[PDB]
Amino acid sequence: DRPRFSFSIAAREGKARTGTIEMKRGVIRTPAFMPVGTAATVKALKPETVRATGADIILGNTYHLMLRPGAERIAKLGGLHSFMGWDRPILTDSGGYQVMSLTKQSEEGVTFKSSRHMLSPERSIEIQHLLGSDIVMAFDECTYPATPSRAASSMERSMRWAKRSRDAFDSRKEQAENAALFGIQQGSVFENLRQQSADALAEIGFDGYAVGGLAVGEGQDEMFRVLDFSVPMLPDDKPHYLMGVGKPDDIVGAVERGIDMFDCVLPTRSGRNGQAFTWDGPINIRNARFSEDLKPLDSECHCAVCQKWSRAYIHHLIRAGEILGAMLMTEHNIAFYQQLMQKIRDSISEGRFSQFAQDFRARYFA
Amino acid sequence: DRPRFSFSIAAREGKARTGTIEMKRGVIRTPAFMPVGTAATVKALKPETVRATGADIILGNTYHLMLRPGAERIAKLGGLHSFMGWDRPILTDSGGYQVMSLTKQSEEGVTFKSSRHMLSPERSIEIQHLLGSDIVMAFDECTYPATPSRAASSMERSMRWAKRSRDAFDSRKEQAENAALFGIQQGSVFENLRQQSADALAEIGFDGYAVGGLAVGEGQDEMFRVLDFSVPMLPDDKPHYLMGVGKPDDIVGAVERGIDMFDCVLPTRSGRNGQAFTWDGPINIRNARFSEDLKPLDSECHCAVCQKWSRAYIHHLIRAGEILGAMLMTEHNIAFYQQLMQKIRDSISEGRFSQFAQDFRARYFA
Numbered sequence: 031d032r033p034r035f036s037f038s039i040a041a042r043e044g045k046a047r048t049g050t051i052e053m054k055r056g057v058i059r060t061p062a063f064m065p066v067g068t069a070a071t072v073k074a075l076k077p078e079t080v081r082a083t084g085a086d087i088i089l090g091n092t093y094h095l096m097l098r099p100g101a102e103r104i105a106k107l108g109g110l111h112s113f114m115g116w117d118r119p120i121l122t123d124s125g126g127y128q129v130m131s132l133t134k135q136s137e138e139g140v141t142f143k144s145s146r147h148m149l150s151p152e153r154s155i156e157i158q159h160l161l162g163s164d165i166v167m168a169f170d171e172c173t174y175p176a177t178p179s180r181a182a183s184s185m186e187r188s189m190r191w192a193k194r195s196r197d198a199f200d201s202r203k204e205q206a207e208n209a210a211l212f213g214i215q216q217g218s219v220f221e222n223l224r225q226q227s228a229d230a231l232a233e234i235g236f237d238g239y240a241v242g243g244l245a246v247g248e249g250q251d252e253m254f255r256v257l258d259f260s261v262p263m264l265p266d267d268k269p270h271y272l273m274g275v276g277k278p279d280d281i282v283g284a285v286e287r288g289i290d291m292f293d294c295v296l297p298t299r300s301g302r303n304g305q306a307f308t309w310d311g312p313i314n315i316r317n318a319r320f321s322e323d324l325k326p327l328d329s330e331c332h333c334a335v336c337q338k339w340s341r342a343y344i345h346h347l348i349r350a351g352e353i354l355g356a357m358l359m360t361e362h363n364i365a366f367y368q369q370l371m372q373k374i375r376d377s378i379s380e381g382r383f384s385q386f387a388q389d390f391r392a393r394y395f396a
Numbered sequence: 397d398r399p400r401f402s403f404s405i406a407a408r409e410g411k412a413r414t415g416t417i418e419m420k421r422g423v424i425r426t427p428a429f430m431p432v433g434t435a436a437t438v439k440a441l442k443p444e445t446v447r448a449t450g451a452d453i454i455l456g457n458t459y460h461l462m463l464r465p466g467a468e469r470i471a472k473l474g475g476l477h478s479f480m481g482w483d484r485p486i487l488t489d490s491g492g493y494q495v496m497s498l499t500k501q502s503e504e505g506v507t508f509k510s511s512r513h514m515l516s517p518e519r520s521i522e523i524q525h526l527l528g529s530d531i532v533m534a535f536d537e538c539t540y541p542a543t544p545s546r547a548a549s550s551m552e553r554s555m556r557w558a559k560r561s562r563d564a565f566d567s568r569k570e571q572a573e574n575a576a577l578f579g580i581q582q583g584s585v586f587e588n589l590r591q592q593s594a595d596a597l598a599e600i601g602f603d604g605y606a607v608g609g610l611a612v613g614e615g616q617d618e619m620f621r622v623l624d625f626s627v628p629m630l631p632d633d634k635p636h637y638l639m640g641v642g643k644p645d646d647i648v649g650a651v652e653r654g655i656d657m658f659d660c661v662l663p664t665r666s667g668r669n670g671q672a673f674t675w676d677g678p679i680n681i682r683n684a685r686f687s688e689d690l691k692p693l694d695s696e697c698h699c700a701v702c703q704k705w706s707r708a709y710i711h712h713l714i715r716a717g718e719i720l721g722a723m724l725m726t727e728h729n730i731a732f733y734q735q736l737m738q739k740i741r742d743s744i745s746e747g748r749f750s751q752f753a754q755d756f757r758a759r760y761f762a
């Protein structure tokens with residue numbers, strides 16, 4: 031058999047780590063990038079295509095699926111894995127962030143209109159149980175910028191909700207035996223609050239630790255500044271998950287600061303919009319300069335799109351609003367992200383990650 | 397090597413025929429259904445997926461590609477096959493119909509606004525040469541309903557244009573050696589005009605013969621009535637192509653009347669709109685009755701979609717406007733159409749096509 035959750039670090043370089051998380055439904059190579067599958071689909075990609083790009087795990091959302099099609103309904107249809115045809119690990123967010131960004135707070139939970147609903151640690155854990163997710167996120171309260179006093183109250187409530195999330199998860203035998211639970215560090219940009227948050231979470235004990243409250247419009251310099259002191263407070267021997275990050279350069283700098291796990295909509299969303307990621311930086315394939323360009327999107331990429339189709343053809347499809355345009359751009363961008371994570375993992379294992387990061391930034395921002 | 401164009405009839409039943417067209421880029425099993433690839437894509441499908449459904453040949457359009465991206469541009473990029481990544485036969489329409497349905501006529505040609513352009517037999521043949529299409533359609537003038545006198549003038553002009561199409565095609569050595577040319581019968585619903593048209597075309601001589609002027613809002617009874625006398629006027633030993641047809645029942649009845657080749661947008665367009673074809677008739681997958689239906693779209697279909705995904709999941713994707721919804725619905729519907737053509741071909745070969753048509757209509761309209 032396979033283990034419920036086992037994280038092993040095979041190599042380090044500075045604060046960077048590379049290794050594996052073994053779970054019942056598969057192995058997750060870290061640092062890992064999770065394609066986002068908001069509405070039980072990674073947009074414009076079959077699951078086999080997601081897997082073909084190298085993805086080991088995808089992200090689903092408690093918030094969208096509890097509304098459409100409904101958590102009980104998904105459970106009746108056999109669970110999210112069966113429903114969408116992805117048989118590998120799935121991490122589900124708790125709904126705390128999407129409840130905010132997409133409405134009455136209290137100590138019990140949140141009530142909101144999407145058309146009237148309530149979420150709580152207990153209800154959030156139960157929804158993720160019904161979905162059958164492999165990595166369950168604790169339910170948290172999100173707020174930026176915010177005063178030291180506001181961020182402290184909001185961090186404190188999240189810590190009380192983390193303990194309730196822990197207890198609700200542990201009360202469900204099948205969930206506790208087959209899934210893993212991650213806590214979410216809060217505290218905004220304030221070091222002392224981040225430390226109190228880390229301590230709270232470590233005293234409860236989780237399988238992994240997310241850094242929340244970033245990637246909310248703070249700029250990379252500030253984000254790195256917070257990661258600089260925040261990540262070392264977390265348990266070293268557990269995975270570190272930076273929620274909602276991000277651009278390729280953000281990912282590289284976050285790995286240099288000890289992050290193991292990432293998710294964001296940028297490769298999928300900006301793909302459909304005409305932005306393709308390349309080692310030479312992003313390009314807008316709608317630009318007229320690509321109309322007769324026979325080169326593939328990226329001259330080194332190994333993905334199926336770059337083996338078969340020219341920039342000129344993809345230029346034409348996107349300008350025409352053709353669905354195949356969105357498919358090919360999305361496949362290429364997800365492949366790019368996975369190739370980036372692969373190169374990150376190999377360079378750490380080989381002890382040349384610093385040189386990789388230097389070489390990557392020189393070429394990408396040339 | 398392979399032949400330029402060789403049609404062989406392997407079996408007959410009544411007026412129905414089954415066989416093969418061998419061309420340089422591949423073999424076309426007949427009766428054949430051509431998925432429509434308007435803007436150099438079969439909407440929402442990779443070419444490998446089109447081929448996986450059973451398609452031997454696809455249809456492209458002189459009218460759309462001469463505007464976007466341009467015929468000379470496609471030729472500079474290596475031809476339509478290379479551009480879109482389909483290496484098998486492509487039939488291109490001449491632009492006559494789309495010029496009408498999507499503006500000054502004369503004996504020389506048509507001038508029109510899409511933004512100002514002109515088409516003629518000579519220009520149409522040259523565009524299809526630049527595209528590299530394998531089956532070239534003659535350029536014709538289209539008009540319904542229309543008086544006997546109007547249809548006769550319009551049929552007469554089309555016949556003069558067919559001879560100019562023939563001469564332009566024959567003047568281009570590489571085209572005449574590697575591609576095939578089809579004439580288009582006109583004459584509206586009038587038997588005498590259809591006969592004069594057939595005679596005109598047969599005196600010129602073509603590799604195949606299309607029936608034009610149908611599938612323009614005439615109803616199936618009238619269409620069958622026209623096919624009843626029209627198809628027998630065409631050369632028996634050449635393929636018979638019914639342009640723009642059609643619904644599954646239309647196809648079956650047209651094969652019973654001697655048609656070998658078909659194209660229409662219905663499987664692709666109505667796929668994206670939520671209509672799925674099944675042996676039990678079409679279904680609208682958006683309907684609430686499918687929200688918890690774990691069966692595949694069709695319980696006999698062998699396509700990849702019906703092997704992996706439930707009606708409930710596809711219901712959810714289409715209701716959410718997800719691209720994967722359009723992909724799966726389109727793949728299934730194109731697979732359905734190809735499975736229909738396969739069952740037609742096998743039943744004719746086995747001499748039980750009449751029984752197939754009976755059994756098909758009983759179940760499909762139950």
Ligand SMILES: CNc1nc2cc3c(cc2[nH]1)N=C(N)NC3
Pocket residue numbers: 123124125126127128167168170172214241242243244245246273274275
């Ligand atoms: C796109 N930015 C982003 N920042 C996040 C931060 C969090 C999150 C998701 C995020 N996405 N999920 C939570 N449950 N809480 C913290």
Ligand SMILES: CNc1nc2cc3c(cc2[nH]1)N=C(N)NC3
Pocket residue numbers: 489490491492493494533534536538580607608609610611612639640641
């Ligand atoms: C959808 N109906 C339809 N009827 C057609 C009839 C013709 C055609 C395309 C059609 N499509 N192309 C031509 N060049 N002429 C006759």
Ligand SMILES: [Zn+2]
Pocket residue numbers: 327328331332333334335336337362365366
């Ligand atoms: Zn690529």
Ligand SMILES: [Zn+2]
Pocket residue numbers: 693694697698699700701702703728731732
């Ligand atoms: Zn199917």
